[PDB]
A paper describes a structure:
In bacteria that live in hosts whose terminal sugar is a sialic acid, [name] ([name]) catalyzes the last step in converting sialic acid into Fructose-6-phosphate. The enzyme [name] exists as a hexamer in Gram-negative bacteria and is allosterically regulated. In Gram-positive bacteria, it exists as a monomer and lacks allosteric regulation. The monomer folds of both HiNagB and PmNagB are conserved and resemble the E.coliNagB open structure with seven-stranded parallel β sheets surrounded by eight α helices.
HiNagB crystallized in the P 21 space group with 12 monomers in the asymmetric unit. The structure of HiNagB was determined to 3.0 Å resolution with the final refined R-factor and R-free of 0.194 and 0.242, respectively. HiNagB forms a hexameric structure (trimer of dimers) similar to E.coliNagB. The interactions between two trimers to form a hexamer are similar to that observed in E.coliNagB. The cryo-EM data analysis confirmed that the hexameric architecture of HiNagB is conserved both in the crystal environment and in the solution. In the case of HiNagB, the molecule is a trimer of dimers. Interestingly, the trimer is not symmetric. The angle between subunits A and B—is 120.6°, 116.9° between A and C, and 122.5° between B and C. This results in a complete 360° rotation. The combination of rotation and translation results in a slight asymmetry in the interactions between the A, B, and C subunits. One could say that while the protein’s oligomeric state is hexameric, there is some shear between the subunits.
Residue numbers in the entry:
A (entry chain B), B (entry chain E), C (entry chain D), D (entry chain C), E (entry chain A), F (entry chain F): 0 to 260
Amino acid sequence: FMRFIPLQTEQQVSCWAAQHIINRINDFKPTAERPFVLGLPTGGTPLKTYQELIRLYQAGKVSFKHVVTFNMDEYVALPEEHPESYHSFMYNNFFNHIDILPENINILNGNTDDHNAECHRYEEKIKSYGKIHLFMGGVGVDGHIAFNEPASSLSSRTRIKTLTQDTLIANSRFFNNDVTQVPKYALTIGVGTLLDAEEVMILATGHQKALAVQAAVEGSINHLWTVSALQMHRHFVLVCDEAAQQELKVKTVKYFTELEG
Amino acid sequence: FMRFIPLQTEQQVSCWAAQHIINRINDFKPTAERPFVLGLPTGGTPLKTYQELIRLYQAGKVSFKHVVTFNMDEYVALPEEHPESYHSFMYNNFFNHIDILPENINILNGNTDDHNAECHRYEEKIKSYGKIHLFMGGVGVDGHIAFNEPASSLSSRTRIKTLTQDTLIANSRFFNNDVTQVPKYALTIGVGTLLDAEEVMILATGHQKALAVQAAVEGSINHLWTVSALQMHRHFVLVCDEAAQQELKVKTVKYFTELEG
Amino acid sequence: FMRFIPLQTEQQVSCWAAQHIINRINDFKPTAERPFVLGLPTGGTPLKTYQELIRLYQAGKVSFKHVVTFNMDEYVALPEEHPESYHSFMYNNFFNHIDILPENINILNGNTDDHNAECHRYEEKIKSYGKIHLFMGGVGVDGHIAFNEPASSLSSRTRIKTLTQDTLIANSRFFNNDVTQVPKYALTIGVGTLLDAEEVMILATGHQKALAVQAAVEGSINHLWTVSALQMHRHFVLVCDEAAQQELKVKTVKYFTELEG
Amino acid sequence: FMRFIPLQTEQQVSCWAAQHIINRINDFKPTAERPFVLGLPTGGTPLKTYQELIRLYQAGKVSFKHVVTFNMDEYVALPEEHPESYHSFMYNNFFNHIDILPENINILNGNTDDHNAECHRYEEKIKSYGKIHLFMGGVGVDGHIAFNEPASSLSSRTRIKTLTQDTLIANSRFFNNDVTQVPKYALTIGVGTLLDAEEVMILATGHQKALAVQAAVEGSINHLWTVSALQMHRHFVLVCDEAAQQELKVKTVKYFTELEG
Amino acid sequence: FMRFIPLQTEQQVSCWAAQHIINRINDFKPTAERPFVLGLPTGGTPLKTYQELIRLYQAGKVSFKHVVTFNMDEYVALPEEHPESYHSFMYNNFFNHIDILPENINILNGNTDDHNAECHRYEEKIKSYGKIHLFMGGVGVDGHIAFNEPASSLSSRTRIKTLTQDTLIANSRFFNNDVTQVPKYALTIGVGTLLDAEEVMILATGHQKALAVQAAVEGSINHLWTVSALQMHRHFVLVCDEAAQQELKVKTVKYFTELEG
Amino acid sequence: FMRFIPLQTEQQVSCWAAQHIINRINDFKPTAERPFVLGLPTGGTPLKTYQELIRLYQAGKVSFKHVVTFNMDEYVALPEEHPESYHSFMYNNFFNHIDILPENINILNGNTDDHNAECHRYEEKIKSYGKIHLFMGGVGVDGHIAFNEPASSLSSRTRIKTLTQDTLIANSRFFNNDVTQVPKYALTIGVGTLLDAEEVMILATGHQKALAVQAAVEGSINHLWTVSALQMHRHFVLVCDEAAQQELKVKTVKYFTELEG
């Protein structure tokens, strides 16, 4: 069944998420021949989690020497050494501070000569390892996942996507508030790619995600709220802060707070 | 306009109600010529409030030597010394334990020769005092007030009412679970009579009152939920326990919890 | 406050309305100096009601010798002896079969030299009688009243109105299915005119009126459903057939069906 | 796919359910080697059906000499000869009045030394017969099935469950209205166990089940209403009384009333 | 997954649908041994599309010399040469004006001696060709498909159906507005038959279809709205006019309007 | 009753508002003895209107000589010459560029020795002129008006208000993104003060105001959405851009778009 973890502060969400990733890896006991495969996102709430994971690694609570990562997405036609590329985000905020092997980091390359070939290569790389064991991600204010469109097929695969006007505006702040400077296209994993993971953990902090949280927990599966499709996943975890609880009914928070005791 | 007091336990609800009545009386400074006029109901939750008022009176925190009371209702064709009459409920559980003057207790007489004249005398008696300063009451699971029907006119007056099938069944527990023994009619104040008070305090405890609480706080005015009409009252107070908050949104409880402190 | 009469067939709706008009007249005991003032509409369901009223008059159960009528509306620039005028509908189907005095029939004149002057004369005529005691009417699928727009001011008065595209289409069947032949304008009473009546009885038969009936009975007051504003009227009666109850909940019909019996 | 049978009285509900069970058995024509497997619940609503089933047996309209029964649940650490055990409920109200073979009655044993082993033995016993042909059951006010929590996996199996505070409160009436006297744990079939039956008949009587019936018939599949998951079952039957129809739309009751007869 | 094409006029809807059928056929490049298989409906909106298909054929933009058609339904016990039979509708409005081979026209025969045998023969004929490549259809005001009941199993097959009271009334206009003159039964494809097609194009024109469009586009899958089940189809296309958009939210139309351009 | 003006761009919203203010003043023909009284707010969309009003003044299309203004609010314990004070906002962006007389500019003083006396003088000053002829304002994301709380009494008066946590965060961007630097309290007009104006024009631009616009146009009056109470105002105007329409139904936008043209 769906696991809903209602918490109060964004730090508690990040600390909980990091702890969950630690426990799965440490229970899995990964080796070189049998690595743990981790799906990873970008953004503000992930950032706090990566920071917590670095702190836990600096202690003696985890090693990434046998963790393989796959990232959700990357901009197209943007140099991968650009400060605002998703390559740069991952290496600067995470991979450069942990003991992961450089050949176990997978991030879509948006500068290939053939974007379809690159997307198929990504899907193949995942299959070569078997399956992603834990995919961490976020959710949009409209319930969309990664750069997938809000009404995306639940069996969509990794493909090239044209960024929406709203996505262009949202990300403008990373490119000098210039909509014309945001890359028009990106490579993203599909909803099917996400659903193929053994466990999907979605992190939702902020009042702007409260409607997405209501759709995920209280609503029925709606094909206009991609996050609601995770209700059909065998292990769907949703962690949220108090601001994102504001649209739920009192009985909903009561039920899940007490279940998690 | 509307004050919503969300509390946890039924005990806290009665204590809050008792304290509020104390403060209203003690601020008002009643005299014999200028008494404080209190509207009073019957039932389980009021009983706890009357008990707390008695304890506060014994603690010399209040005197009723200048409080005039009006009760909501009384059965018709039931001897007023019968255990299950509302005369008996009020005197045995409250008036016989406080310093109220016997001539300041007003309760509808359901044994008159003329129920319309009796109801009219009651409305006149209130007018002779000016106005009820604080009317305490409860609310039905369908939002009805006193013996008024769930679709009662917002200008209904004191009148005779035929008890509903649900009310007959509900009150059967007081007459040996015999529907045939519950009085068929009762004299009740109208919704207009209630709204004419200077302040209306409604007490709502129980999971069975959660939908009525949602209608009063979150919903628009609906003529099928009489309690919602109190939204237009100049001083409408609603006190409720945890079980009755369960249908509200987290943001609704949050807003009013913080306002009151 | 609101009376809802849920019936099965359109015949039952018409008979109930006729009986109600009969009973109001007979209780009022009208005289020449103090006549009973009746507001009247046109249409299919009214036709059956007028037929039933004629039968009751022939059965000497009522006299209209002291009833004054005001009609809702009339086409502009249509000869008043034209078959499709509302003058013709009223006289041919009703007034020519009863004992009403010819000088007590009031119908807006859509052939005046000054429609604003004409509309003002109509409002003045009504005030000269005091108030309409019972106004019968229908309701549009969008809850609109007469030729008033669905968002009409609740204080709109009798005025000239440009017929909507939907009203032109609906009424084409009376002019050889030719939208170009329907009069473009009409003189209509306002929503304020309707609410000034002592009692408003609206008759709603048909599956296409089920949403309007739901808005009037179950919904809160919405200014886009003019019929719902009648919830705040002192005597609002709504009579409907089974097809018009299909959007209501079983509890709504149960409460009112048992109240009326 | 889904059959909804709306009736008026609890007697009609029990009569319909009993007849359906009769018809399935008699069509199946069970033998000793190929028995009919019947799943059975506990509670007030089942009781009337069991009484009706006894009467139909007395009327020689059915024989249980070749029916094998499996019950949903039983208390743990309560002697099975205790008046309030479900063993006692089934035997006193049903099995002691019909011709079932004593070795064909299966009820979870809450007094074993190994509750997991007992639960597995129960699932195995079902497997040994093939599958349950008809599972009769009730529904909680929150749509839960048997002792499963409203957030149980739709593939949950027979297991030990800690009774919720709500179930403890509900069941206090059988243990002197004392929450501390209700057994803390119980053995219950899972939602998966129920869904593995060839047909599921849910019985819903009472005003307190109106919201649950709305969730099963009118709502989409919601993972917080276990009863709504039965919409995906190949043969889902829901029988309900008039009090449980109160939250449905008139069009829903109309549709199914006409379809079923 | 789901394609929603919001257009303005009914003409544009039929023109779009015709063009889509043309393009599917021309890409498929059908041969006699490998024909293109087309599913076809009856009604007002299909009529305009067939007219456009005839115009495009005269313009030599398409040939049906290798198109095989299957129709949704046909009346029972009505001579197939009757003006109001669906045989007549299809031949008069379509087949008599195109170059389809007469042995490639498939329409259920409601005059067989064995309606179950006929329905199985129809299902078998579809199987003999493999699958329907494109199924065009309409939608009822309650979201039902063909003569399937609004609560039909999503795996229903071609079968005989008793026409509902509402269906009898709707079709009365073709039989002298006499409910008793409409055939009581019809042969119809099942919902499973429709879902087995490679692509399903539903056409929805009219204000009376706006609620069904909202259920298909905005709502979750509801087993009382058959059209909503098409959300789970691999290629579901819904084309509608402005009147059918009136119940959608502005953001819904905006999203899909921009997607298609 | 209520005018809803749906437009596309924020420029059009400000231009319409300015034009409306122009036309009201010019029709009124104000003199020194009989001035036009204008209520004014602060914020981004108002600023664009003030620029347009200055442009219209430079074009000699209006004079503000005989115009008296009243502002909604002002911070307390902030020097009125501070860049971020509302005194500074109004003078720098409006009053210093028009021909208003310095003795006709009214703005609450948040630096008085007695804020209650200060509030009363403000209400009295309004009464001394008679009534505000046109009050322009904005609306919060929760429908709140000025610094009034979202559940404010509809008869609240000018008073001191403690800024909510949300208001502190929102305005932090004007004080170096420092919540601790935003003044804790503010002087604000009450909801009653707004309703006492002869006309209320609310301007709503932005996707974050779409829910407030839906509450004002489509919803019933809710005491938790202050803007919805303006439905009972004699002349309530709401102007909005395309981003703020996104939550309305297509039929709502269609109706009012056609009404205004």
